[PDB]
C-alpha cells in the first residue's frame, strides 16, 4: 500500500496472507468469507507469462495477522488448503478479466477478536454502494513505494467513473472490473502495490453497518502514478460463480 497508514488491531479481521512455503515469502493478500473459504485473485496463483502456477501444496494461508514478518504466536492461525478453484474464464492472456479464485481450507478456523469473515454483497448493496465518488478501503502488506511495511497498511480510495478508468490505460476494461483512486488534481494519493494483489476492497454499508467486499485488488500500472488507477475484480458480477462452487462441495 502506497500512502496508507498502519492498520489498527482487529481493523480488518478478514484479511488473509497468502504465504509461500519454500522459500518463505508473502505472495498476495486474500480475504476470509466463511470459516472454510478464502477469496483472492486468480493471478496470485496462475499466471503462465511468468511461469506462475501454484497448487494447494505450495501455499499456506495465514489469518489474524497484523505484523508482516513476525509469527504472531497465540494470535494468527495458519491453514493448509484443500482445493483451489480458479474462474474457468479467467483471462490471463489479455487483461486479467475475471481475476478471481476461491480456496477451501483443509479445516475450519475458529473466529476470534482477530479472525472474522467479511460479507459478500447482494444485488442491492452492490447497486447502492458501487458509485463513483464513494470510498472503499484497501488493506495489505505490499510495498510502500513502486520499502516494505512492518504492520498491515490501510488506505481509503474513491471509486472512479468508468470513462476515466478506460481513458487512463491502453488495456481493454471489462464489466468485471472497476477502478479506484484519486485523480491528479484532488491532492490526496494512495494505491495498492506489489504484494497487495488478491486483497479486499471493502465498503461499510450505511444501512446495516456491515462491511462488504466489493472488489479484489487485481492490477495497476505502477503504483500511485498520477493519472493511473488501481483496478479491482467486481465481486458482485462474479457472485453467481462464487455461489456455484461453494454449493458444489
Amino acid at each position: 500500500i502506497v500512502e496508507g497508514s498502519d492498520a489498527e488491531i482487529g481493523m480488518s479481521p478478514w484479511q488473509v496472507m497468502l504465504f509461500r512455503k519454500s522459500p518463505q515469502e508473502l505472495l498476495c493478500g486474500a480475504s476470509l468469507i466463511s470459516d472454510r473459504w478464502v477469496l483472492t485473485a486468480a493471478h496470485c496463483l496462475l499466471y503462465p507469462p511468468w511461469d506462475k502456477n501454484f497448487t494447494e501444496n505450495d501455499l499456506l494461508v495465514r489469518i489474524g495477522k497484523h505484523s508482516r514478518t513476525r509469527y504472531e504466536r497465540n494470535i494468527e492461525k495458519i491453514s493448509m488448503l484443500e482445493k483451489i478453484y480458479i474462474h474457468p474464464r479467467y483471462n490471463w492472456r489479455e487483461n486479467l478479466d475475471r481475476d478471481i479464485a476461491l480456496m477451501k481450507l483443509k479445516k475450519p478456523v475458529a473466529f476470534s477478536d482477530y479472525i472474522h469473515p467479511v460479507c459478500l454483497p447482494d444485488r442491492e448493496t452492490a447497486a447502492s454502494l458501487l458509485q463513483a465518488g464513494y470510498k472503499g478501503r484497501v488493506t495489505g502488506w505490499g510495498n510502500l513505494k513502486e520499502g516494505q511495511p512492518s504492520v498491515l497498511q490501510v488506505v481509503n480510495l474513491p471509486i472512479v467513473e468508468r470513462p476515466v478508468c478506460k481513458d487512463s490505460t491502453r488495456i481493454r476494461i471489462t464489466d468485471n472490473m472497476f477502478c479506484a483512486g484519486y485523480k491528479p488534481d484532488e491532492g490526496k494519493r494512495g494505491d495498492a502495490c506489489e504484494g497487495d494483489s488478491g486483497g479486499p476492497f471493502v465498503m461499510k454499508s450505511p444501512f446495516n453497518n456491515r462491511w462488504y467486499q466489493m472488489g479484489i485488488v487485481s492490477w495497476g500500472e505502477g503504483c500511485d502514478r498520477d493519472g493511473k488507477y488501481g483496478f479491482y475484480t467486481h465481486v458482485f458480477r462474479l457472485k453467481k460463480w462464487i455461489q456455484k462452487v461453494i454449493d458444489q462441495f
Binding site: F19, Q24, E25, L26, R68, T69, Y71, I78, M80, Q148
Partner: peptide, 10 residues
C-alpha cells in the same frame, strides 16, 4: 526476512 513458522505447518 520472515520469522520461522512452526514445522507442523510445512
Amino acid at each position: 526476512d520472515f520469522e520461522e513458522i512452526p514445522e507442523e505447518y510445512l
